[PDB]
Structure formats: C-alpha cells, structure tokens
Symmetry: D2
Subunit: 316 residues, 4 copies
C-alpha cells in the first residue's frame, strides 16, 4: 500500500525460485530482469498464474531493459558469468571470472545510481564478499542499504545437518558462520545451540560425538561442491535465504541474520565487506553485531578476510 | 503425526518446484524419484536445507529406486520421455511419444500396485486425460483415488487474465474449463464470475468487451505454447496447481477443483477420463459434479473426449 | 518499512480478537484505544507476548488518549455498546442509543480530522450504515477512505451454512448480501455459486431444496440473535471479517468485498451509505460495483436503504 | 492424517482464543466442551463462520457431553476453578483451589481413560505442575502422552522483554525457564541468547545492563499479576503457547519446547512433574532433555520442585 517493487537482476535458477516464493508470500510486484532475451518473459508469465493458487496479487513481469530498475524498493543481484571456452577439460579457471563479473557490477551499479538510488540491495553473485563491495562502490548507495548473501545460507546447512543427527526441528538449531562465504567460512563451534542449549551438553550426553561434529563441519564446507557434482550450483536454499533477508526488510521484522556488510573496524578490519550477524529492519541494516571472538577464532576470521582482499586486488 | 509420505515420480522441472512448495507448506516427507542418476539426490539435498528458512521439518530424499514408493500416501506422476540421438534439437512431438509414455505408465502402475496400493495418485504426464486412465488401469487403484491435472491449471490462466483486465484479485475471478487438458479444452463463458458477479454484468457495463473476452479465451488455450516459445514447457503454475490438489486431500479441505476423473455416464460418456469439477477430501474424490451444459457446450465436451479417445487409440500406432 | 500503524478505537471483545489476528498475520503496530482505564493496557500486554509464538514483530500498546491516533494508517471503530441496559436478550435489538453514538462519532471524527486525516477508516459500531455516514461527515475524510462492516460478515454465514449442507470448503461458496447490515439485509439467491457453479444446479440435482435455502436465509438474518440467545456477541467472525478488509487495503490485494459505502446514484439512491460489492486496494475503495438487480431485488434494496434513512433522520 | 480432532475441555477465555487459532491455522476439527450449558455452543457458532475468512475447513462444535472425547487426537484441559465459591479477593489463597481442581481432574481423567486413551493431552489448569500429574494418574495415559503448559508461555515474556530492549525480532531471543510454572520458576540467565549470541556479549557492549536484566526477570515472574492488576487473568499468549505445543505434535515438527513432564531421576527428582526442555513430535514426547545445571541453578530447581511437592502433599 502501495505494493513494494522487487527487481531480480538475473533470472536464472535462483531468480526463478525467488519469483515463485515472492508470489507464495504475496511480498511485492516482481520484475524478472535478464540479459537473455525472452527467457525472463516466459518465466514471469508462468509464475504470474500462480497468484491464483497462492491467493496473492503480485504483478510478475519479465524484462531485458535496465529501465525497470526505476521505482525498485528491493534489488536482488544474481547476474554473473560462468563456464569457459576451449579450455580442456577440467581446468576452468577461478579467478578470471572476476574481471568479467566486475564489468557486470559496473553496468548494474550505474543504472542503480541513476534509477533507484534509494533501493535496498542484496548481492548474491560470487565471490559474494568481493562483488557486494564492487556494487556498493559503483552504485553509490549508503552502507546500510547493501548486503551480501552468505551466512543465512551457510548456517542453514549446518543447522540442518546437526538437527538430523539430534532428531529436532531444523530451525531449533542456532549457529553462526562468519568471515566470508566460501571455503574460508568460519564455523564457530562455541556458538552452536540446540533449542537454546549449548551443543556441548549433547556431546557430553553422547547424543553426538566430537568426530561427528567435525564431519558435519566438513560437509557444510563441501555442500556446494557436493551438489554441483550431482546436479549444478544450488538454487532452492539460496533463494529461500535471500527471500528471508528481503522479507525482514520489507516487513521491518528486525531478524538477526548473518550477512556480508561493510566492516569499519570490527574484528580489526576496514575497507572490506565480511560476514557478520546484523539486524535487518525497515530502514536497512539497523545494527552490525561484532562477536567477541577469541584468538583462534579471530585468526580464522583474518584468513577469511585476507582471501576477500586477495580477490579484490585482482580487479583493476 | 505421523507425517504424510509424498513421492514425486519424476523429478524434473515440475518435480523441483513441487518439492520446494511441499517444504514451504510443511506438508510431508518427500521422495524425489527419477530414472536420471544423481539429479534427484542433488535437488533433494539443496531443497532439504530450505526447511530452516521455512520453519518446516520435511525430510527430502532423492531416489533412483521404485522401492521407495513403499508406504506413500500421495504419489505424483510427472514421469515421461525423454528424447534420443537423431534427430534434434526439438524433434519430440507427442503423437509418437504415446506408446513410449504408455510403457512408463505400465511400469509405474505395477510398482504402485505392489508397494502403495492405498496411495492417492495425481497424474500430470501429457496427454493427461489419456495417461491418467492408463495408470488407473495398470495400478489397480479405486476410481476415487486417482485424478489428472488439468482444469485447476487451465482455469488459473483464464482467472488471471480476466482479473488483470478488471483490476481485481486473481482468485476473485471464478471460471470453469472442462472436457480435456489441451487444445480441445472447453471454456465456459456462461460460468465466469467476478467477486460472485456474472461476467456478463461487466460486459454490459463496458468494463471488458466480447472481443476482449474472446482474445483472453484464445490466450488461455495457447498459453503453454506461448511460454514454450519464450522459454520451455511451463512448471511453476503446474506445480502450484498440483500442490493445491494434494493439500485438499492431505488436509481434507473439500475444495471443488476441476480435475480429470473417470466418467461413468456423466455428459453421456463412460470408459474414459475427462475434466469436470469435483470435491477432493481426505477420502479422495468425494463428489463428481456434472455441469448442466446446453447443447452447444455439450458438443464441445463431445469433441474433447473424442480427441482423448483418438490419442488413446494411438498407444499402439506404428 | 515503515510498518503500518493500526488504531483500534474500541478495545472490547472484537478489538481483542482483531489485535490477536493482527499479530498472527504480522500486519502492523497496534494501538488498543478505549475509554475504560487500564483495560486496553492489560489486553495489549497479554497480546504483545504472542509475537514470540507467531514469529511476528508488531508493537501492541494500550491507550486512553485520542492523541495516539497520530499517524494512523488504518483506524477501526468498534466504540459504542453491545446491548441496551435494562433491555434483555430475548428482545435483543437497537434504538434510543442513536444520539449517544452520534456524539461518539462526532468526537471520534473531530480527532481523526486533526490527527490522522489520511487514514483508511472501518466503522463497525451499530447501526453501521448510519454510523459510518456520521463519522464520514465529522471526520472530513474522502469517500474512498471510509467503509462500514456489513456484507463480508453477513455473507460468511450464508457461505458457511450452504457449504455444510453441500459438504464443500466454506470459501468455495460465493454469495452476495447487500442493501444494509441488519434485518433488512438483501440476500440474493440468484447470485449464489458453489465452486463457481450456480446454486440452482444443486437445487435441480436435489442436493439442497428451495425450502432449505429459505431456512438458511432466515438463519443468516437471525444469526446474531441465535448467538446472543446462547451467550453473547458474535466477536470472532466480525473480527476476522474486519481484518480481511483491513489486509486487502494494507497489502493492495484488490479483493471484491461487500461493504458499506457512500451511494451516489447507485440503485437509485444518494446521500446515504449502502452495502454493495467494492474493490479494496492500496488507495482505499478503487471501484464500487453496482449489481444489475431486477425489480423484485431493487424493491428489497429500497426497503433496506429506507430503514437506514429512518434512523439517520432521527438523531 | 487427514482431519485431526482437537477437544478443548474448558471453553472459557483461553478456549475461545485456542479455537480461533486452530481455525486460522486449519489444524483440525474443534470441540468446545464446557460444563456451562449453551455458552460453548454459542462460541462455536461464532467461531465456525471464521472458516470463510481463513480459507479453512475445521468443524467447530460446542458440547456439554464428554462423549465428544471419543476419537480425540489432542485434548486440551483448561477446565477448573479460578477462585473458591463464596470467597472475596481479599481472602484469596492459591492453596484453596487444590481440592476443587483435583475433583475436576478426577472427573476428566475417568472419561479420557474410557474414551480417548491414545490422545495426546495438554494440561493448563493451575497449579499446572500438580494438576498435570493428577490427570496423568487418573487418566492412565503413558508418560510420553501428557504435558503441562508452563515454559513456552513464561519464556515468551522473557524473550519479548529482552527483544524490546535490544531492538530485535522477539523470536530471535532464546531463553529457558525451568522447574515449575509460577513464582518459583527458574530463570536461567546463563542460557539466554540473542540471534544465537550469548546475552553476556550484549551486557559487555552495554546494550543492556545487569540491573536491566534483573528488572526484566522480576517483570517476567510477575507478568500475570501485572495483567490482573490492569484486567486479566492472561489468555491470548497462553492460547498461542498451547497451540504451538499442539501443532508440534499434530505436524511432527519436533520443536524443542519447555513443558511440564514426568521426572524419572532428571535433576535428582522423581515421582513429580517439572518444567524442562523436551521434544514434541508425532508420537508425543520424543526426548526429555536434562540440562547440565551448575550447583546454584540446581538448588533453584530443587526449590521449585519442593513447592510442587508441597501442594501435591495437600491433596
Ligand atoms: N552468495 C551465495 O551464498 C551464493 C551465490 N551463488 C551465486 O549466484 C549467482 C547466480 O546463481 P544461478 O541463478 O544458479 O546462476 P544462473 O546462471 O542460472 O543465473 C545467472 C543469470 O544472470 C544472467 N546475467 C548475466 N549477465 C547479466 C547482466 N549483466 N544483467 C542481468 N542478468 C545477467 C544470466 O543470463 C543468467 O540468467 C552465481 O554467481 C552463483 O555463483 C550461488 C549460490 C549461493
Ligand atoms: N497435465 C498438465 O496440465 C501438464 C502436464 N505437463 C507434463 O508433465 C510432464 C513433466 O513436465 P516437466 O517436469 O516439465 O518435464 P521434465 O522433462 O523436466 O520431467 C520429467 C522427468 O521424468 C523423468 N522420467 C522418465 N521416466 C521416468 C520413470 N519411469 N520414473 C521416474 N521418472 C522418470 C525424466 O527423467 C525427467 O526428469 C510432461 O509430460 C509434461 O508434458 C506439463 C504441464 C502441464
Ligand atoms: N457491523 C457489524 O456486522 C457488527 C457490529 N458489531 C458492533 O460493534 C460494536 C462493538 O462490539 P463488541 O466489541 O462486541 O462490544 P464491546 O462492548 O465488548 O466493546 C465496545 C468497547 O467500546 C468502548 N468504548 C465506548 N465508547 C468509546 C469511545 N468513546 N472511544 C473508544 N472506546 C469506546 C467500550 O468501553 C467497550 O470496551 C458494537 O456496537 C456491536 O454491536 C458487532 C458485530 C457485528
Ligand atoms: N498453565 C499456565 O501457564 C496457565 C494456566 N492458566 C489456568 O488456565 C485455567 C483456565 O484459564 P481461563 O480460560 O482464563 O479461565 P476461564 O474461567 O475463563 O475458563 C475455565 C472454564 O472451565 C469451565 N469448567 C470448570 N469446570 C469444568 C469441568 N468440570 N469440565 C469442563 N469445563 C469446566 C468453566 O465453565 C470455564 O468456562 C485456569 O485454571 C488458569 O489458572 C492460565 C494462564 C496460564
């Protein structure tokens, strides 16, 4: 009243699930944007009919024009490159990626600056902790108005695996994974709770062993690789995580969610984005919570941020 | 208590969205079954993590074994061929696919009979009015325990396009589409209401014209084609429609939903499945409602069933 | 963002259920206003804890001050009285209370005009079709920003009773009740559908008779009496009906809902509020739909509006 | 599976809100049972209409016959005295209700044994930790199939108050209150977290002081009295807490919820019910979690169970 406008910049796998979930939850009008012609229009048409089943009323439209950024309340960026040429046959590089995805962020940021400078922006494009800062820089939006997906998704894996071993509801496990999305993500064993009860109590009661916990941490780290091996880059859980973040903003819920945000001295770091618990409210990032890490924990957090800094320095 | 078991026989595009929606609604444990190796397992793992975001607790597992049909409460069949070397990259059709999908329904039917004969079955595989009857015949399930997807999806399109012209909530439009899923679907102009009000009133008040209605009618018939030409065969709205049907069963809601069901004299037809409103409750199909069509509407219904019979008669064509 | 502000002017039985449902649906911050001291503060404290179980974040506060209307997005008025003192329940009716309630609507109107002139207003206080016009006049709010509760609740009963005879989901019955809320309500048999199918088809197939339909019409008209003769106040269904209306506004859903709205030549009547299908969207009443009634139906609508005029000219 | 049946034994303030919430969530058919004639039939009629607004299909019926217990999946017991007949508020003595509510548990227990021995039972009647055990004994139901309301409600207050000081979503605060429902509830400061983060981190950062936390504890213990002083006993949040417990069973969610349950050695205590975290799934109580309390926390638990034992000894 008047209906929020959500622009999906990128209408691939994650984009399609997000449009579906937005309709289920009656969250706002959706523009599915892509550079690929016709594809976002077909997805939007199919998704728009699902309003009837959902008892919702969200316009869902497809676009190949950046003009549709005008009026956006929320912009979600999943746009990016992948795959490789000639290369033979398993040596697809990392890494350079990174200039190609940077050029995408330059293009998107320029239009955000021109067309929707007051939007709340969520960046998903990998490596997320690098790309979110690039978009921040190219778009000119305030620091409280842009974040990156990482912790909500990474902790959903950890929560889920622990919950299946302990035979409890998945959401009754709480856990924090910080620093960066990716292989350097910091899993904080000390902050795992189950129904509000420290994980250690379940270990002492022999409900789960130290070994099993370590195998679950390794599985959490290997999950994207596990699913890519079987199928493709994951998309259902990533979309669910993003919509949880977007909804906290649109409904001023003030959920505490771990996301990539600009660090300004926290954990000893500045001029860089990193994963940390934060509060998402109707004005955007309302609080950035700095965890009271011990020495071993801070050193893993430093390694996570050093890798973000490394990749960022490959951009010229 | 103790949590329904839902098996998706076919874990493609439609299968993926259904698993996603089942988790969102906390509806039951899900087995994602497919003949394609690794694909269901990967989709099931990705989907299982979304339980955290949804505050749900549905196990989601992937399978390449029919044994996992054991104990199913609901079985949803989207399984179908399936193209080979040739002969590309579009050479597919569906006329020649009829004997091939027949063979799929035989295989699935024999397994349902041995492993989950008390399941409620929803068939999606095209042409659905043909395939649902084939599954009924080879599974042995009672007539009230098997239906095909059609009307809920077809009417969603008609309801949607009308609501956008009249500027009202999509679900506040009501419409009935009967006969068969496909190009011979019967769109009943007489039975369209908007907030309970006959469509003819909005026409009389020049809010929409007769030409605009016919244009919306053509767009509804050709919607699958329109989306295929932009993208691929539709899957988000089909999944939503199937889940609304499954939920009515699992929660005994008793929604009146247009679905393909065994006709036993209704509309003058027997020994065939066709689309008609019916009531889905906790026992399956509780009521089959026969619309009181005029002569001109009945002729159209006749044409829909004739086309289903034509295709059924090609399950052994060479 | 920023979170809507909903003020409940009246915090009795219906107010209490409305605040509960607002939290369940996470629809906005709630101010529970009443003239009774401490009571709305007590209900608000209780209700605020239910945010935890609902995974919501709605502030629920109690107020005895009209100043809390400031910056309201939605104002729901149930302030007045349920039953006449000295009067029993075997007679449960209405009258002599009009002038008092007009003095309430004058007083509430004054405050709305000053503190929340851009709010969407829902009037619930009986006789609703009279009371909503009074508040409209004294609040100065535009015609598309104020409606009365009537048809959504009246039609919920008709839909429910028909759904139970025919063994289908209650919401799969559609029905229109118009004219006025109360004993002169116009139940339109022609407009009833079940799963989009004319009721007449089920009458033809002997699933329900013309006389059972007549008995359901009577039961619908007399439902409030039936409840009061058993123990008081419909409040649960009235609250769910109002929240359905409020939500359609707050979420721009554009539902077609029968409510009390200013008539401007529709059905032949003007300068009066009447019950008719409307579209509620993000800007308030976006459309008023005039049913194409036949002479027998238009005469019943006339008798409904005439009873509203009989009470309007009498304060 | 497919329409569960929920029987509400007691259709007073909490029963009315519970029936409302079951319909909203489409959780099951509802029987509103009470010894008061006509009243639950009136409440059930009002409530049934709300199925339309909710898009639900739950039958809601009122009853004065215990026959309605046959086929129950869940039975919720709020039946009981709130004050002794012929006494004033100045003469209030909580122990006075023990023999009066004991008689009610005996009556209800005999009918459960005969009619729905496989139902999951949730006891609400105060003092709940005593009453739940009386119903256990008289009903003969297995220990995994009967629990008392306490910790879900008590922790909702603590969670809510902390969340308002810290400006976060109420449900993102986690806390455990154990031992008994009432003034000797054990508020475990050590176990409080906010977004999974120990409460102490927020103290260290001066977002909240130790004194503020103490005043929150006091407020939490005294909330029912606060609400009564304004106008209670509380009913919205109690109803929501009970529905969260019943839903975890009906949908096999396996939520961890603090409820009153038979102690068989946990915390050094036996032959008594006390509040502790536990898992509710489709078979009932699937796990009872014994917290690893330190010595000081342990003595607070002992003091709470001592008071349950004192009151049980009165019978
Ligand atoms: N941050 C996180 O926790 C996670 C991040 N991801 C990342 O999310 C991104 C997207 O994932 P999927 O949807 O699975 O990939 P996808 O390949 O299916 O979608 C990418 C879409 O972006 C489009 N695109 C390319 N350039 C564009 C431009 N300039 N403007 C608009 N659209 C453009 C492509 O046409 C494609 O449709 C990838 O970078 C992936 O690595 C994936 C999972 C988790
Ligand atoms: N009834 C209706 O209103 C509509 C019907 N459809 C039909 O639904 C079907 C599926 O649609 P999509 O999911 O988009 O197709 P899809 O090709 O993505 O999914 C079909 C899946 O079935 C699998 N399969 C083949 N044989 C199998 C077997 N014996 N057991 C288990 N899986 C097997 C394939 O491996 C494939 O993964 C098609 O026949 C399509 O024409 C689509 C839309 C609407
Ligand atoms: N339009 C409809 O379909 C229906 C209308 N109603 C009507 O709605 C009204 C409320 O019903 P209940 O909540 O059951 O009544 P209730 O008596 O329980 O609550 C009314 C509240 O309004 C308060 N109040 C009185 N004057 C006030 C003022 N100056 N400002 C603020 N608050 C004031 C009273 O203190 C009382 O708490 C009654 O007029 C009732 O007859 C009830 C059902 C349906
Ligand atoms: N366990 C907890 O955390 C809490 C417990 N309570 C308790 O819950 C109980 C109910 O609370 P309210 O609904 O507010 O009280 P209420 O007085 O409104 O409802 C109690 C109902 O039980 C009925 N009743 C009495 N004996 C009965 C019997 N033999 N069979 C059937 N019905 C019978 C009465 O007619 C009355 O309608 C009280 O004992 C109260 O102390 C209240 C809040 C929290």
């Amino acid at each position: 009243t008047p209906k929020p406008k959500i622009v999906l910049v990128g209408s691939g796998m994650i984009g399609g699930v997000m449009a579906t979930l937005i309709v289920q939850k009656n969250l706002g009008d959706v523009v599915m944007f892509d550079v690929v012609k016709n594809m976002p229009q077909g997805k939007a048409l199919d998704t728009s009919h699902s309003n009837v089943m959902a008892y919702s009323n969200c316009k869902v439209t497809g676009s190949n024009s950046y003009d549709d950024l005008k009026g956006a309340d929320v912009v979600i960026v999943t746009a990016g490159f992948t795959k490789a040429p000639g290369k033979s046959d398993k040596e697809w590089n990392r890494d350079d990626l990174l200039p190609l995805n940077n050029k995408i962020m330059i293009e998107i940021g320029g239009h955000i600056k021109n067309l929707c400078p007051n939007a709340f922006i969520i960046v998903v494009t990998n490596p997320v902790d690098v790309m979110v800062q690039l978009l921040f820089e190219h778009s000119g939006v305030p620091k409280n108005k842009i974040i990156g997906l990482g912790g909500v998704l990474d902790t959903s894996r950890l929560k889920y695996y622990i919950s299946q071993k302990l035979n409890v509801c998945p959401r009754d496990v709480n856990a924090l994974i910080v620093g960066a999305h990716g292989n350097k993500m910091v899993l904080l064993k000390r902050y795992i709770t189950v129904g509000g009860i420290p994980l250690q109590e379940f270990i002492n009661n022999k409900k789960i062993t130290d070994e099993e916990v370590e195998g679950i941490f390794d599985r959490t780290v290997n999950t994207a690789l596990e699913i890519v091996n079987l199928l493709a880059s994951p998309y259902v859980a990533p979309a669910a995580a993003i919509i949880e973040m977007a909804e906290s903003y649109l409904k001023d819920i003030k959920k505490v969610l771990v996301c990539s945000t600009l660090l300004e001295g926290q954990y000893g770091h500045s001029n860089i984005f990193g994963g940390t618990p934060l509060v998402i409210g109707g004005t955007g990032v309302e609080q950035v919570i700095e965890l009271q890490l011990n020495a071993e924990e801070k050193t893993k957090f430093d390694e996570a941020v050093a890798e973000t800094k490394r990749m960022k320095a490959l951009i010229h």
